[PDB]
Design a protein around this ligand. Structure first.
Ligand SMILES: Nc1ncnc2c1ncn2[C@@H]1O[C@H](COP(=O)(O)OP(=O)(O)O)[C@@H](O)[C@H]1O
Length: 300
């Protein structure tokens, strides 16, 4: 064998993180993740219990899949930040599958969050969940969490409202690192220098961050809604219609419209050199993130 040894040498380094299956119990079906279902329950860190969600993949798939499964956890262990989801352990060979244990975010992801609290914005626009005081702090938490990733020479390459989870504290954190690589497909969240060229940088992550901001101020619309995935690879290269054109007419004079337009510029020499240029903006204008909606909900 030549691919069945990679698994058993990898778990040697991740051996201090193994937990017996008698310390993990499954209660809920939290959601349908990318590769398998995620379950919700409680895990005991040999001392006390904590509410936890688990990513699970059965032991029937190829070893090629199990290596990527454990590589997500190995990368996740190198992180510690109040705006990044932190794992607490793994579990090797429990009965039918392999377990990935990561803390529970009570209020789910951000896209389903906004999609469910849409009419609440049209009827109660000053609510503790969805007011510019909270939306700006949320986008700010995502920003400094991505700045923490970039600080330690990491590129996420997949910034969207699907990979940002919110907890009962209503603080948001970075969620999915399935596509995260080292420092030097979601095409709608990718700058053109990363689409036709396959090169990723901090500026490509800033492009996806600006797309996330458009996704937030619209409460979850599908970027470039109405254009197929084949029409967008040709339209974004020749600088026609930045994402700002897809906004309601209530924008195009605001501070958030310009911001996502500077974060999403074809000339990456004009894009911010670091996430801290964007973060320092979110302090001079603390009510920039506003809900800009229509009377017709978005159609996925
Ligand atoms: N720790 C968690 N807390 C709450 N929900 C989660 C958690 N982990 C995963 N999920 C749910 O499972 C899916 C995320 O799994 P993943 O494969 O990481 O997909 P994504 O690309 O959305 O991050 C989402 O639907 C999300 O709502």
């Amino acid at each position: 064998n030549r691919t069945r040894k990679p698994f058993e040498e990898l778990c040697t380094e991740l051996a201090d993180l193994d937990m017996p299956a008698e310390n993990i119990v499954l209660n809920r079906r939290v959601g349908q993740g990318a590769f398998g279902l995620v379950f919700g329950g409680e895990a005991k860190k040999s001392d006390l219990w904590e509410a936890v969600a688990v990513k699970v993949i059965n032991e029937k798939a190829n070893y090629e899949g199990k290596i990527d499964f454990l590589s997500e956890a190995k990368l996740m262990r190198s992180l510690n930040h109040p705006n990044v989801v932190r794992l607490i352990g793994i579990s090797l060979n429990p009965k039918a599958s392999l377990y990935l244990i990561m803390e529970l975010m009570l209020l789910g992801d951000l896209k389903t969050y906004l999609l469910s609290r849409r009419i609440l914005a049209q009827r109660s626009p000053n609510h503790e969940d969805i007011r510019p005081s909270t939306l700006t702090q949320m986008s700010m938490d995502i920003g400094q969490g991505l700045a923490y990733l970039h600080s330690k020479h990491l590129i996420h390459r997949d910034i969207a409202c699907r990979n940002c989870l919110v907890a009962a504290d209503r603080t948001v954190k970075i969620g999915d690192f399935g596509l995260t690589r080292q420092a030097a497909l979601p095409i709608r969240w990718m700058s053109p220098e990363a689409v036709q060229f396959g090169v990723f940088s901090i500026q490509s992550d800033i492009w996806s961050f600006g797309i996330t901001l458009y996704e937030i101020i619209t409460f979850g619309v599908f970027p470039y809604n109405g254009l197929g995935d084949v029409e967008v690879v040709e339209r974004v290269k020749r600088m026609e219609f930045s994402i700002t054109e897809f906004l309601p007419p209530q924008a195009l004079n605001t501070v958030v419209c310009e911001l996502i337009n500077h974060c999403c510029k074809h000339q990456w020499q004009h894009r911010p050199s670091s996430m801290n240029q964007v973060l320092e903006v979110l302090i001079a204008y603390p009510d920039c993130i506003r809900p800009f909606l229509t009377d017709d909900p978005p159609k996925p």
